[PDB]
Design a protein around this motif. Structure first.
Motif, mmCIF file in Angstrom:
data_model
loop_
_atom_site.group_PDB
_atom_site.id
_atom_site.type_symbol
_atom_site.label_atom_id
_atom_site.label_comp_id
_atom_site.label_asym_id
_atom_site.label_seq_id
_atom_site.Cartn_x
_atom_site.Cartn_y
_atom_site.Cartn_z
ATOM 1 N N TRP A 164 -2.939 -133.943 -34.314
ATOM 2 C CA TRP A 164 -2.137 -133.970 -32.930
ATOM 3 C C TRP A 164 -1.017 -133.213 -32.932
ATOM 4 N N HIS A 165 -0.706 -132.595 -34.113
ATOM 5 C CA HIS A 165 0.680 -131.981 -34.209
ATOM 6 C C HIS A 165 0.572 -130.664 -33.718
ATOM 7 N N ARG B 40 -0.187 -130.840 -29.664
ATOM 8 C CA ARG B 40 0.836 -131.859 -28.854
ATOM 9 C C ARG B 40 1.000 -131.659 -27.466
ATOM 10 N N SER B 41 1.040 -130.543 -27.020
ATOM 11 C CA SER B 41 1.299 -130.130 -25.685
ATOM 12 C C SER B 41 -0.118 -130.116 -24.737
ATOM 13 N N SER C 25 0.201 -134.037 -24.372
ATOM 14 C CA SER C 25 1.030 -134.574 -23.304
ATOM 15 C C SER C 25 0.605 -134.389 -22.021
ATOM 16 N N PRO D 174 6.210 -139.715 -30.820
ATOM 17 C CA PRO D 174 5.156 -138.843 -30.274
ATOM 18 C C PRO D 174 3.852 -139.210 -31.060
ATOM 19 N N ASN D 175 3.452 -140.314 -31.444
ATOM 20 C CA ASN D 175 2.471 -140.544 -32.575
ATOM 21 C C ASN D 175 1.546 -141.529 -32.255
#
Ligand SMILES: Nc1nc2c(ncn2[C@@H]2O[C@H](COP(=O)(O)OP(=O)(O)OP(=O)(O)O)[C@@H](O)[C@H]2O)c(=O)[nH]1
Ligand SMILES: [Mg+2]
Lengths: 51, 51, 297, 81, 154, 85, 146, 115, 55, 249, 157
Positions: free
Chosen positions: J3-4, J7-8, J11, J224-225
């Motif tokens: 996910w890191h 991430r965009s 989102s 955000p996890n």
């Protein structure tokens, strides 16, 4: 101080509510004695609309 | 549940308006409606065989 | 299509349709067979269905020839009123009666505008009187339908019979099922004017009815009602308002007077009062006080 | 003349009630008692019914001074006049 | 199970003679399949019970023709041969229902009615809170409270 | 037969004041326990007259249509003569 | 059209309907010694007179130039007469007295008493009847902050 | 003379019925009363409702209404759980037998309200 | 609101002896003898098939 | 699962929200989709919080107040089953989960080891004897939700079947205050708790210790996890204007 | 449409616990409410009301009306607050007739909103300026409404 109508069934069940024992009475259906002895004064139609 | 019935005067509200209880008292003033004091708020049962 | 609804809208529909049954305004200022000024309903009652049916042909033909005559002598009165006439000064003072009109201040109607308003209403009266006459000339005995409002005047309306059965022993052996029954026909007479000559003729149909056949009369007429804002004034609510304790059982006789409440139209002048001081105390104008008291200077 | 329910009789209820105290003295009306005023002369008028609050009956609600009970079983043997 | 009263037993031929009313009622027969389908077993006597009673209700309004006479008893004995075959299949499903619902009731810790035998737990007739204070058929007094057939914690 | 409409009309401990008695205790005694007007004397009293304290205190004559009660006691006070027989 | 007519500015003219039943016997109770109480029994049973008036006819200008019934006036009128108003027509069934002449008088004063209390909405906003909104409980987004 | 004695005897038996302790009106076979004494319903009764049941002496009508107002297991505490019947819940404390309901005295007129 | 307290309790006691002093007050319900026949002496009971309510 | 770096992307998929809620009519693929998500995530060795049906928590057997959280409540039978099966499901990841914010002076009987992993913490909670398991889960669930809310490196998918039950009131009600006040007798106490039942205000789901840790991670924007791919349930009874009594068979 | 039982079973000979046959007064029927009118054994005013057909039908009509009431009140996720005419939204600025007075009124057919005004429920977070003007601190947070035009997972992007 008053209470709202209940939302559960067991609260309606366990509340101290008496049941009907004697003959039931209505304020205007007592001149007519019974549904079998339903008294009618004048033989008007049941769909007779009053003007 | 068990609560107390409240009343707000029109002088207390920021926008004054006629409430529904003094309209009930005005309706009871005209047509001479008997207001039963110990009428319970929980016992509002519709005649579902007819209604 | 197809019809699927929420049930609580259907629960609201079926209760509102039966409670608003006789919430109907019959005498409307409108067109033909719907609109009228007075509505007469004669409910004929007899023991056999062909007895009330043959009476409904006898009374309707009677009320057709009578009802054509009374409208025609009214039609000859409208056509003279439409040719020309003089306006009533009591009618002219009725239009110039309000203080403020729609345009602000006194609306001064002259003799042309007041005569225009009755001419606009008499033009409606001619089109409604011709609707009765043209429907009274339709039912020829070759082709007649007195159960339809568009063809014949008056029309006959169906009503279901009152039938009440009895269940009794014929002896604990057997049970007999006999019923009392009587049949109904309603005759709807819609006239666009109130005439006592037709009400006299309608009431006298009871003297030549059929054998073992009776009738009752329904009359729906328009009548002007005055709401007096001086006898029944619009007042502010009192400082100490009423509670539920004034609406107890047997409070309809002990706590409340009957409507209306008596308000004093007489007063006595105090020591240092003037014409403007009594009018200030009574909450009226000083010119309004002198008009009711023109006896005393 | 009003007809139908008693709610339509405003003056006749007023004319009755003023006539009711008009003929009746208070020397007569004081002797009529209710049911609970007569029941107070019983050795015990008041005890709970088994519909709502039967569990609140205590042993102090019994008039034990007007009877004699047996020593073995515990039931009442006799009554006092 | 909330039916804990003492009951009256019926012969199995009086059950099947009801037909579409209770024995082959379609709302009852579909929830008897969901018992066998949950346990992962064939509903084979249940389906052939339903296929027979599907076609039995199809012609049940027809009147039989008058048997004018046969020299030998062949089609009369054959029609009774198939009729006694259809009863033995429905006798099996009447036993298949009562066997499996008592085996399920031993698993879900649900107590049966009075004088009812569950083979895993109570080989005798389990009686609980009867009007008669003793055993109706074993002649032994019932204790208070009722007999615990299972363990405590759910 | 209609429900409890017969023209021709038992001890219990927890239903003592509520079996064959009035619904409320605030309601007054019936007409049979009072003298209506000028009487020459009644041969019997009705069975719906509630036994009071003065019935056992005075004890002049108790005439129930017959039944003559010569046993005055305090356990009879508060209920009518229907339950006393 | 019969009825009184008010020319003063404190008197408003309401065109209204009146429906009544008149019934006379002609078969058996036409005339004998039973005709006296039977005709009275027909008149007491037919004591109803229906006073009907449209709210659209009440929305006219008064003698002072202001409208007789505005929007807030009929909003107060529909609440004070709950089941007496139906399909835009205020209907009053007078059944108090035995004769129909007193029921027309009793129906008239009950119309004028109902109209006078509904006319309080023209005095100010403090007599305007309140709107009953079924506002929701706080949502699950706001309940997450609990 | 004996009708006054039998009335006082029946009224004494009704008050001693109101004072004496009954057995547990809940049936220990059904959910959720089937569970162990150290988990579930019996934990909530031991630490919050222990004096409430002991003061009303385990009659079937107060202890069911105490289960209503305790709120932490309703509303399915009263309807889902099977209770003992009316003639079974009137048995006194320490019953342990089915013959005790017929062992009680039939002479008094308590209408089924005798121990 | 006008009559409360002792004025209510004394009025209820005054209306009770006024009710009791009327010898001959018809307090009998209607259904007790509403089964009387006028042409014959046959006595029926209201509610069953031995009586018809209209005639 | 990574996910890191995406991430965009994640989102923009959730439109900035914390996760997805799946709603529709009754009997559609709502719970049938939610069991597929744990099949998608646990086969990709991701730590998953799976509530298989939310009616064990809200519409549970019995409700108990929280031991260490004042004003909060617990579903103890739902919690011991949750703390049992979550330990067995992600045993490969929770054994590598070092306890960051967890007190090391936990109560521990003779023969048991103090927990050093998050797998050992959940086995400390649900594996106990009654009634010591009732208060052990309230300590364990609160310290589980404290440990999960601080982890900002490992993706934790939280799947809940029937989030609409967690969004409104649980069917439990508050106890009457006469039960905790204490009484000497019932005849003179001015109470009717044994006489008439009454409906107290209903306890919301936000006052449960399990949903408190969930709503802490949802509303606070420092996580955000966690991805809340949940759904609703429409398993309610039918009611179409009138209702008699349901036949038991 | 409801599939529950409304009428009471009639009176006949005493039923037994058989197949398709339940006793007349059992704990399974009507949720155990028949225990008020049952007899355990296989005083005249207390025995005949249990056997009258009109009396036992009226009690089930009360109990079914109680079940109708509690399910109509459990559907209520709202409450009625008397809001004055000026601060009310535009769809409530009309003349609203009472219940069973007129035709069931559509809300606003001009804006293509055909729904009953009597079943209209407004969210509390919309009327914070009307219901709470005295607080001034925004006690309820604003409702997060999703962007319908934003490319999300449901729109394959
Ligand atoms: N194997 C499989 N079965 C499915 C699938 N979708 C729906 N079903 C079937 O559809 C039924 C409905 O499943 P659920 O998801 O539990 O229904 P629901 O929407 O959750 O119903 P509620 O809980 O009342 O809201 C299940 O019993 C499945 O058998 C699917 O994708 N795969
Ligand atoms: Mg689901």
């Amino acid at each position: 101080v008053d209470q709202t109508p209940f939302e559960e069934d067991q609260t309606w069940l366990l509340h101290s509510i008496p049941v009907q024992q004697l003959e039931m009475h209505h304020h205007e259906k007592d001149l007519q004695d019974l549904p079998f002895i339903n008294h009618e004064q004048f033989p008007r139609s049941l769909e007779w609309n009053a003007p | 549940g068990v609560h107390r019935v409240g009343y707000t005067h029109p002088s207390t509200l920021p926008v004054p308006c006629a409430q529904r209880w003094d309209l009930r008292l005005a309706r009871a003033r005209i047509f001479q409606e008997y207001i039963e004091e110990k009428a319970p708020g929980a016992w509002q049962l519709e005649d579902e065989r007819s209604m | 299509f197809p019809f699927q609804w929420k049930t609580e809208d259907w629960y609201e529909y079926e209760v509102a349709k039966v409670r608003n049954r006789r919430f109907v305004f019959e005498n409307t200022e409108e067109d033909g067979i719907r609109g009228s000024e007075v509505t007469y309903k004669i409910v004929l009652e007899g023991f056999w269905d062909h007895h009330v049916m043959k009476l409904a042909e006898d009374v309707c033909m009677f009320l057709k020839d009578v009802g054509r005559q009374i409208v025609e002598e009214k039609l000859v009165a409208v056509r003279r009123l439409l040719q020309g006439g003089a306006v009533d000064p009591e009618l002219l003072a009725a239009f110039n009666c309000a203080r403020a009109g729609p345009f602000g201040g006194l609306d001064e109607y002259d003799k042309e505008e007041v005569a225009n308003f009755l001419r606009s209403d008499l033009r409606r009266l001619e089109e409604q009187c011709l609707s009765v006459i043209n429907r009274c000339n339709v039912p020829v005995p070759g082709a007649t339908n007195i159960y339809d409002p568009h063809t014949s005047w008056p029309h006959v309306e169906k009503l279901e019979p009152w039938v009440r059965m009895a269940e009794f022993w014929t002896s604990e052996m057997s049970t007999a099922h006999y019923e009392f029954r009587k049949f109904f026909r309603v005759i709807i007479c819609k006239l666009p004017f109130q005439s006592t000559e037709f009400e006299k003729r309608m009431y006298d149909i009871r003297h030549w009815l059929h054998r073992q056949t009776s009738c009752e009369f329904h009359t729906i007429y328009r009548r002007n009602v005055i709401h007096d804002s001086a006898v029944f004034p619009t007042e502010h609510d009192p400082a100490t308002p009423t509670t539920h304790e004034h609406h107890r059982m047997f409070s309809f006789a002990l706590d409340w007077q009957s409507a209306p409440v008596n308000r004093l139209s007489t007063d006595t002048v105090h020591e240092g009062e003037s014409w403007d001081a009594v009018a200030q105390r009574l909450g009226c104008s000083v010119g309004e006080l002198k008009d009711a008291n023109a006896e005393r200077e | 003349s009003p007809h139908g329910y008693i709610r339509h009789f405003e003056n006749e209820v007023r004319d009755l009630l003023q006539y009711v105290d008009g003929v009746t003295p208070w020397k007569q009306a004081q002797k009529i008692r209710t049911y609970w005023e007569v029941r107070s002369h019983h050795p015990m008028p008041q005890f709970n019914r088994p519909e709502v609050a039967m569990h609140r009956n205590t042993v102090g609600l019994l008039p034990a001074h007007m009877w004699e009970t047996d020593k073995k079983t515990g039931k009442v043997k006799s009554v006092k006049d | 199970n909330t039916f804990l009263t003492s009951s009256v037993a019926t012969p199995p031929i009086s059950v099947i003679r009801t037909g579409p009313k209770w024995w082959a009622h379609p709302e009852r027969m579909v929830r008897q399949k969901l018992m066998y389908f949950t346990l992962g077993v064939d509903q084979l006597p249940l389906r052939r019970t339903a296929v027979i009673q599907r076609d039995l209700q199809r012609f049940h309004m027809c009147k039989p023709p008058p048997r004018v006479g046969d020299s030998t008893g062949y089609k009369r004995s054959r029609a009774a041969q198939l009729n006694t075959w259809y009863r033995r299949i429905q006798y099996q499903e009447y036993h298949m229902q009562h066997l499996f619902t008592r085996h399920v009731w031993g698993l879900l810790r649900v107590y049966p009615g009075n004088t009812t035998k569950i083979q895993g737990k109570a080989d005798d007739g389990y009686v609980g809170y009867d009007s008669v204070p003793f055993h109706r058929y074993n002649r032994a007094p019932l204790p208070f409270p009722a007999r615990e057939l299972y363990e405590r914690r759910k | 037969y209609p429900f409890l409409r017969r023209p021709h009309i038992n001890p219990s401990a927890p239903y003592f004041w509520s079996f064959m008695t009035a619904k409320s205790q605030m309601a007054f005694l019936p007409e049979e326990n009072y003298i209506t007007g000028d009487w020459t004397g009644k041969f019997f009293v009705s069975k719906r007259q509630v036994y009071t304290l003065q019935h056992a205190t005075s004890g002049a004559k108790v005439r129930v249509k017959i039944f003559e009660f010569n046993s005055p006691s305090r356990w009879n006070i508060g209920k009518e003569m229907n339950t006393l027989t | 059209r019969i009825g009184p007519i008010g020319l003063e500015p404190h008197q408003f003219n309401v065109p209204a309907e009146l429906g009544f039943v008149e019934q006379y016997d002609n078969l058996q109770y036409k005339r004998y010694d039973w005709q006296g109480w039977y005709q009275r029994m027909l008149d007491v049973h037919n004591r109803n007179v229906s006073l009907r008036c449209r709210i659209c006819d009440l929305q006219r200008l008064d003698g002072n130039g202001v409208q007789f019934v505005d929007m807030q006036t009929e909003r107060r009128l529909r609440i004070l007469a709950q089941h007496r108003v139906g399909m835009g027509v205020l209907k009053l069934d007078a059944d108090k007295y035995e004769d129909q002449a007193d029921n027309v008088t009793f129906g008239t004063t009950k119309l004028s008493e109902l109209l006078a209390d509904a006319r309080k909405a023209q005095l100010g906003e403090e007599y305007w009847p309140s709107v009953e909104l079924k506002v929701r409980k706080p949502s699950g987004q706001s309940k997450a902050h609990y | 003379l004996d009708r006054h004695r039998a009335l006082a005897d029946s009224l004494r038996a009704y008050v001693e019925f109101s004072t004496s302790k009954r057995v547990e009106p809940w049936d220990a076979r059904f959910k959720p009363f089937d569970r162990i004494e150290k988990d579930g319903v019996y934990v909530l009764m031991r630490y919050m409702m222990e004096e409430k049941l002991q003061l009303c002496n385990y009659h079937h009508r107060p202890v069911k209404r105490l289960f209503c107002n305790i709120g932490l297991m309703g509303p399915q505490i009263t309807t889902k759980a099977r209770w003992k019947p009316y003639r079974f819940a009137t048995n006194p404390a320490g019953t342990s037998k089915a013959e005790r309901m017929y062992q009680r005295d039939k002479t008094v007129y308590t209408h089924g309200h005798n121990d | 609101k006008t009559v409360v307290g002792t004025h209510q309790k004394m009025l209820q006691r005054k209306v009770t002896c006024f009710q009791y002093n009327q010898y001959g007050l018809f307090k009998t319900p209607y259904y007790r003898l509403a089964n009387v026949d006028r042409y014959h002496a046959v006595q029926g009971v209201a509610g069953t098939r031995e009586w018809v309510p209209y005639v | 699962q990574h996910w890191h770096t995406k991430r965009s992307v994640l989102s923009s998929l959730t439109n900035g929200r914390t996760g997805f809620i799946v709603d529709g009519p009754t009997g559609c693929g709502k719970s049938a989709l939610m069991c597929q998500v744990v099949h998608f995530a646990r086969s990709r060795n991701i730590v998953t919080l799976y509530v298989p049906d939310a009616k064990v928590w809200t519409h549970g057997e019995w409700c108990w107040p929280s031991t260490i959280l004042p004003g909060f409540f617990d579903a103890p039978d739902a919690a011991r089953s949750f703390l049992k099966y979550f330990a067995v499901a992600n045993r490969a990841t929770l054994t590598s989960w070092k306890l960051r914010c967890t007190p090391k002076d936990l109560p521990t009987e003779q023969g048991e080891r103090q927990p050093q992993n998050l797998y050992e913490l959940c086995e400390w909670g649900h594996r106990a004897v009654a009634p010591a398991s009732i208060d052990r889960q309230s300590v364990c669930v609160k310290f589980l939700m404290d440990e999960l809310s601080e982890e900002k490196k490992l993706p934790v998918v939280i799947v809940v079947d029937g989030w609409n039950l967690f969004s409104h009131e649980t069917h439990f009600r508050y106890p009457h205050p006469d039960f905790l006040r204490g009484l000497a007798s019932f005849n003179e106490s001015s109470t009717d708790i044994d006489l008439y039942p009454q409906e107290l205000p209903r306890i919301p789901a936000s006052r449960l210790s399990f949903v408190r840790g969930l709503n802490k991670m949802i509303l606070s924007g420092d996580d955000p996890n966690k991805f809340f791919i949940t759904c609703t349930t429409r398993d309610f009874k039918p009611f179409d204007g009138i209702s008699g009594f349901p036949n038991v068979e | 449409v409801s599939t529950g039982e409304f009428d009471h079973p009639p009176f006949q000979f005493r039923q037994r616990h058989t197949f398709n046959t339940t006793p007349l007064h059992d704990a399974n029927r009507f949720g155990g409410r028949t225990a008020y009118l049952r007899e355990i054994g296989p005083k005249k005013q207390g025995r005949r009301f249990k056997k009258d057909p009109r009396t036992v039908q009226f009690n089930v009509d009360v109990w079914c009306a109680q079940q109708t009431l509690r399910k109509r009140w459990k559907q209520r996720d709202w409450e009625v607050i008397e809001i004055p005419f000026r601060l009310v939204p535009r769809e409530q600025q009309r003349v609203i007739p009472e219940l069973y007075t007129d035709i069931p009124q559509m809300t606003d057919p001009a804006r293509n909103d055909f729904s009953n005004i009597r079943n209209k429920v407004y969210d509390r977070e919309e009327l914070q300026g009307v219901l709470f003007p005295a607080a001034g601190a925004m006690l309820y947070p604003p409702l997060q409404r999703v962007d319908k035009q934003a490319m999300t997972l449901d729109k394959y992007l």
